[PDB]
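Q: What would this complex look like in 3D?
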Amino acid sequence: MDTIQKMNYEATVNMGRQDLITREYTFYSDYEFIPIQEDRKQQMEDALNNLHKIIHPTVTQLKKKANVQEIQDRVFRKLQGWEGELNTCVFSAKNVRDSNFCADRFTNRINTEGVEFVKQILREY
Amino acid sequence: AKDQPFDVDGFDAKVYPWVRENNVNDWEYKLVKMRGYFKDQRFFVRRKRDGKEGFLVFAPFVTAVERVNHRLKQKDLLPVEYSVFVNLGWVPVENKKDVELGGEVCPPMDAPTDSTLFVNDTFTGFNPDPANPEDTEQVTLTEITGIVRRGEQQDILARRRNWNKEGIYNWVDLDYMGKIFRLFNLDAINTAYIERVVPSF
Amino acid sequence: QKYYTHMEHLWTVHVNRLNQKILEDPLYTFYPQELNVPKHNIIVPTIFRDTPQ
Amino acid sequence: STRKIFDSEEQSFIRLVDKFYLGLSLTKLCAQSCNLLRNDISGSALTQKEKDCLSICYNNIEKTQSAFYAKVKTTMNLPAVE
Amino acid sequence: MEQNTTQVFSDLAYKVCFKVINDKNKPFVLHDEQRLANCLTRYVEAFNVTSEYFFRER
Amino acid sequence: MILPHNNRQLARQYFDSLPENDINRKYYEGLKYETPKTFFGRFLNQFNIDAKLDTLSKFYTYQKTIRATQAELQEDRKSYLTNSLL
Amino acid sequence: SDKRKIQHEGIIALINYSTLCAQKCDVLKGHDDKITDTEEQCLRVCAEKIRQTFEFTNDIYLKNPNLTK
Amino acid sequence: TVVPTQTFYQMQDYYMLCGLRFERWFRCDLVYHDQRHTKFDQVKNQKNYKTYPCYREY
Amino acid sequence: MDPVLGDVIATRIYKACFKHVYGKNMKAYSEKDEAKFDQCLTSYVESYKSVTNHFITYLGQLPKKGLSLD
Amino acid sequence: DTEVSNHNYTQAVAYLNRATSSCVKKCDSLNNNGSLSSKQESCLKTCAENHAIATKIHAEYIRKLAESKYL
Amino acid sequence: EDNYAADVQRQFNRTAFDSLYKICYNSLVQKNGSTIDFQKQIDCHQRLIQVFAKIAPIVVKVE
Amino acid sequence: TFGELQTADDYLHVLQLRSQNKWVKNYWNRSLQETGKTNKAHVISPQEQLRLSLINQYKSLNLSSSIKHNAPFINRDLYVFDDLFSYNLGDITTKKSLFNDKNSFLTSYSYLNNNSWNNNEFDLIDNLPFTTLFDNNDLFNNYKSFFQDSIFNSPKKQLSSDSKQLFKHIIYRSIKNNIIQDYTKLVKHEDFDEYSRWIKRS
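A: Here is my prediction, written as structure tokens for the whole assembly.
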């Protein structure tokens, strides 16, 4: 590559390597929890994508941003209520088995309760 | 006279049996073999031997070392040294200055023939390798044999009075000696001390 | 009198649990150390990799 | 990139240990091939049918071991030291 | 000697773990990164249970 | 708070160990309990507080509210008894 | 050195048979890191069987030196 | 403009406007900061790069 | 590295080929077995070179520190 | 400007030997006329990558396990 | 020299004896490691001892 | 040229990226490097175990006897092992020890040997067993990068400490004897310097 291209490429990689160098530095007096597994991460991402798929038609049709924010605000409050349960249980989880169980409960709650709530509010709008 | 000494090695080196079981009465006047390295500091206690004025010389003896630094490449944390006072002998008053600081008490013990022994002991943590590849791990060991003794106490009638501030000592005060030399193994130091015994030269 | 009502409510909850056949330990139960599961303190972060994007 | 780590006596002992483990691996391998470890065989007896398999195993190991090691060493062609 | 015991303990742990993680031989994925960690934890836990039982009195 | 797999079901264990003919057995079968509403019924029930606390302690030992109730009641008994004696 | 070697052999035997029980009980899995009660019971049973087999082997060898030496 | 200067245009110092504008950017930053190098201008493939959402407030 | 390491390499290669050749049939030694061992040795060496190249390449490409093109 | 010890070099070779032994056994790379087939080469490449990931994870896990027992 | 050689020989025999016993136990035990026949295990151990004894001189050498 | 911010950002983003790269390089090398402490730095306060606490605490001292009685291994008192098998071994002029396992014995011997800890440069060790790295610079560069990681290239003291902890864990969880456990009592506190703009806690 050219000199300019190499500098740009070097800048991009270094900006993406912030995590690589921050990993080495860790704090002792820290409450360390078990991170959620990658498999559960993807399942929760898939569950959220399903909600977006259900919500996409209504929001796009809406022409006033005030209504969209209200739908977002109501759904966020519902999701945030279950989020607190997930964080509290995951933080107290003593093994990946407990972390998996909490994530499974969180995603299953979204798939059943979240979908029903989202379908109900969208129909009202 | 029976000459049946007890070798203090392994876990005993770190936790002396008399300290462990609080049986200084039973262990008193017993031959004990110890291996370790002395400290530079020396302590003098007024005493008369064979009717001649002099001082008893006491030096710390590191019988075990523990390393508690997991950030080896970052910081060179000092280790935790478990030591016991050992009486190096008696010297006349006029020859007190002759005592060399950090003197070579006994020649270092010969290195073990077995190669597997050139590793940090699981209990003591010492490594008898003459040339340890790790400079920080290098340590020289010497073998000594002595008699475990009970610490003395204040006795005015016996003319055993100590003035710590003025540096005048007449009875061995293991508690004070441990504090001034700043030895971690204070509890064991106060428990008892060893008196080195050597065959008639 | 101080504990009559408190005891009745505790007894009422116990009966309701039995009727529903809920014999599992209720909420806010803290077992001794023996029955507490140890916490896994060994965590290995995943190897870092540059994002393809 | 060979380097002088061990001495002559130590080097020889390591080879003996390596050969000793090779013998155990070959012992298990030949036993598995000859199928002399079954759940339907009782007693510390070796039938002539199994002994023939063991004898074939021993001859094959003896004939091939020295030749194979020389070939591998020639292929590896590790450089000398100093 | 003690170092050898730990090395054998580590080498055996890796062998048993990998034979389970890489059964299908498919390329490892970020999730398989933690699955290897999980098997190692189970291996150590299984050793602790087995060793403790062997030294149980009587 | 305790996950289903991390629950030791100590209450179930105690229930299983109970006799065949027990009041707790009847409640499990479907017997319903109603607190007395008459003065005479309440007066009789006044003396059953100790029995109820003991069985609840056995059933739900280590429960926060039950354990707290026992501690407060025991302290009140000691505090009241000594005050009465004094 | 003999005492050290015996201790070294004893620990290695503990590791080797601990791995054997783990493989035979199939306690090694990647879905989680917690060994269930059933899997824990299997390890204890496997450990007990190994102990009994060694105890029987030690007794008969002591009673009769059937080895060819 | 996303945050008009008319909020505190009476003041020539713009010290309150500076605090308000920075606060608004930070709220936007807290949402998109960790995705900047994945789906925004800081992607290695500069051809398919998207402007950072909080650029205007910045 | 030490020559004992090379001997261990030879021991592993010999054991692997012995399994490949006699593990299946387990017959008497013949002249054709000499060729089979030679063919097995070459294949194993090629496999060792291939896996080593991939093993080194992958761990080298894994990021370790901030990139510096100078 | 980095230095490597003989023990570390030997350890690296040990990892290579372990990877080669496992991949050869799993992929049956010895079934050929001395030239690796395209399918065999692909399987070895995949196996080598998995071992490289696995060995690093195992080394990190052991180090953390030792450290946790340490502090 | 003789004492060291005897010690090495004893170490090799003990390791070989243990390793062969493990091989038989692994191959013989079944049903999730919960069942095994002690007599059959002994017979397997004796048979492998004979095999190793015949294989020891052939493989173990100083060249 | 239209200076609309979104399209103007096309010119700005590249220049900002370069400046960030310069700033981030300095931050890693000098600012973060000097101020930060890696691997959970903390202060250790040791305490000696007092005779009051040492009352009937260590009831076992000969760990070997417990291992022999309970370890799942054949009795070591048999006299068959003296001449059970025959091997062609000689020239054993020094005491030799046997390491178990067919794959870890070589590593253990290398660790024990002192000459194995001599430092070697890349230009001197650019030769793998079967592959030569002197004519494969691309492979050589990866080889160098692979060894850059500290996990695969650690000092002897780190390896010795790691082995010591593993052995302590194995013995304690197997025999459940407190002699192997540390005699000292450690109290650990994180003395983090919060007066720094480069590293912040969470």
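A: To summarize the key features: The radius of gyration of chain C is 23 Å. Residues 7 and 13 of chain C are 10 Å apart (CA to CA).
Q: Very helpful, thank you.
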